[PDB]
Paper text:
HphA is composed of a C-terminal 8-stranded β-barrel packed against an N-terminal clamp-like structure through 6 intermediate β-strands. Once secreted, HphA has the dual capacity of binding hemoglobin and scavenging heme. HphA along with its cognate receptor, HphR, function together as a two-component receptor required for full virulence and facilitating extrapulmonary dissemination and/or survival in the blood.
All apo HphA chains adopt an open conformation and do not show structural heterogeneity in the heme-binding region. Comparison of holo and apo structures reveals that the loop containing H43 undergoes a large conformational change upon heme binding and release, while the 310 helix containing H106 is only slightly displaced. Apo HphA interacts specifically with hemoglobin conjugated to agarose beads as evidenced by pull-down. This mode of binding is plausible as the loop containing H43 is flexible and could wedge itself into the heme-binding site, positioning HphA to capture spontaneously released heme using H106 in a relatively quick step. The loop containing H43 then dissociates from Hb and clamps down on heme in a relatively slower binding step.
Numbering used by the authors: 21 to 264
The structure:
Amino acid sequence: SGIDGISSNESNIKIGAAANASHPGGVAAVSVQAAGAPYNAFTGFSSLKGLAQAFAAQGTSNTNVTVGSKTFNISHIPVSAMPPSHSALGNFNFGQVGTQEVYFGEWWKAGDTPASASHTVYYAGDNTNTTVPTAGTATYTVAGINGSGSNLLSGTFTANYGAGTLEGTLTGTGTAVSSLSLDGVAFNPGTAAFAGLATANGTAGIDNSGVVQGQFFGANASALAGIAQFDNVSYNTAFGGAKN
């Protein structure tokens, strides 16, 4: 019980819980494993939102973005906008699913781009209260991050709880990925973790090498989050969704 999540490269990014919290295990956090001490500590995403607000005049941003009926708080933290002593922490773009304890995002090393091998995607959320129905259907409004803090992928995912399948496609402009389609993404009915394959289209053409991993979160599966990794790392994407 507590924070669950996945990173596409644990040499660069690990997810966990913020230490010394009022809710041990309940505050989603991220560690830049690519950095040495003291830059590799686990920092709560909530604190990173605060930094993205605090450095806004220098080029970071924190914005409540509406996608249909849902709000996704987006934090954009490029190395170029942060003081030199923060260069080892690298570049972040991440989102929060509403006010739920569910975060999803990406990272890459200082001096790299999202096309570089260090492009890493992750999600993190509190599993403590998660339950998933064993029957019926629901839809989610989903936002995706792919190499940008200003242009998001968006779409609707459909959860078939009786069949144990998650289906749908995200689309967007201004990112390497133009469309991302779940292929056989599935879960045991009544359980939270899902995985499968994916196909992206975009500025490099079709890439069907995608592997998707994620999970439902919250009472009655009020949210979901996950990652999609491809042979072409510029297509690596993190996503989060709120149940409609």
